[PDB]
Amino acid sequence: TATSTETKTITRIIHYVDKVTNQNVKEDVVQPVTLSRTKTENKVTGVVTYGEWTTGNWDEVISGKIDKYKDPDIPTVESQEVTSDSSDKEITVRYDRLST
């Protein structure tokens, strides 16, 4: 009965770009969540059993105001539950320059 732990990381990245030029107007926000489960192996029979994975959450991220730009298309990126079935995500928040 040998016990070990398996872990994996699921990540959401938020990008902030100019709507037209696609230049990044803010630093990326990177949200890694590391889930785990127990692994039990009988070394005589070779039988391996796995426990349930933990769960996580990508936190809400408010898109800040940037000088010279209108309000972002997405004012806030919502928090999201992360499970072992979740895939990595990328979200792009877009800012358009003032009309002036």
Q: Which CATH number fits domain 1-100: 3.40.50.300, 2.40.320.10, 2.60.40.10, 2.60.40.4300?
A: 2.60.40.4300
Resolution, rounded to a tenth of an Å?
A: 2.0
Please spell the DSSP secondary structure of 40-54, one letter per residue.
Answer: EE-TTT--EEE-PPP
Question: 6, 35 in Cβ contact below 8 A?
Answer: no
Query: Which technique was the structure solved with, according to the deposited record?
Result: X-ray
**Cα 49 to Cα 59: distance, rounded to the nearest angstrom:** 32
Nearest-10 Cα torsion for 24, 57, 36, 15: -10
Domain ranges within the chain, ordered by starting residue: 1-100
Question: Cβ neighbours of residue 22 under 8 Å, at least 6 residues apart?
Answer: none
